[PDB]
């Protein structure tokens, strides 16, 4: 196989085509899930994928519909309560 595909950054799958031939399919590994800014906890509502897959989706299908989507719900409530208490 080609030296570029000899690297482990590609994932290799042996696929048999309709004509009976055996070919090797290559593709890039998917990125990991997004994490909370503060506690570093996995987030929700943010699908995994490469930039092409992200651009394939609309805006509302990539983040939850609530303020501060970059924080987990616990941190979001923490920040909101702290902010309102400081304001009042």
Q: What minimum distance in Å lies between the beta carbon of 47 and RNA?
A: 4
| Interactions with RNA, residue window 7-46 (CB under 7 A) | 7-9, 11-23, 25-26, 28-35, 37, 41-46
Question: CA-to-CA distance for 10 and 56, rounded, in angstroms?
Answer: 22
Nearer to RNA by Cβ, of 15 and 88: the residue is 15
3-state SS assignment for residue 10: strand
- And the tokens for 1? 């196989």
Residues 63, 69: Cα–Cα separation, whole Å: 6
Smallest gap from residue 57 Cβ to Zn ion (A): 24
Distance CA 37, CA 22 (A): 46
The yes or no reply on residue 84 touching RNA (CB under 7 A) is no
Distance in Å, CB of 87 to RNA, minimum: 14
């Amino acid at each position: 196989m080609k030296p570029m595909y000899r690297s482990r950054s590609w994932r290799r799958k042996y696929v048999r085509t309709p004509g009976g031939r055996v070919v090797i399919h290559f593709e890039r590994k998917k990125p990991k899930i997004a994490h909370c800014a503060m506690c570093g906890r996995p987030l929700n509502g943010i699908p995994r994928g490469r930039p092409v897959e992200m651009r394939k989706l609309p805006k509302t299908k990539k983040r939850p519909e609530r303020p501060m989507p970059h924080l987990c719900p616990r941190c979001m409530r923490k920040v909101m309560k702290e902010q309102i208490r400081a304001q009042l």
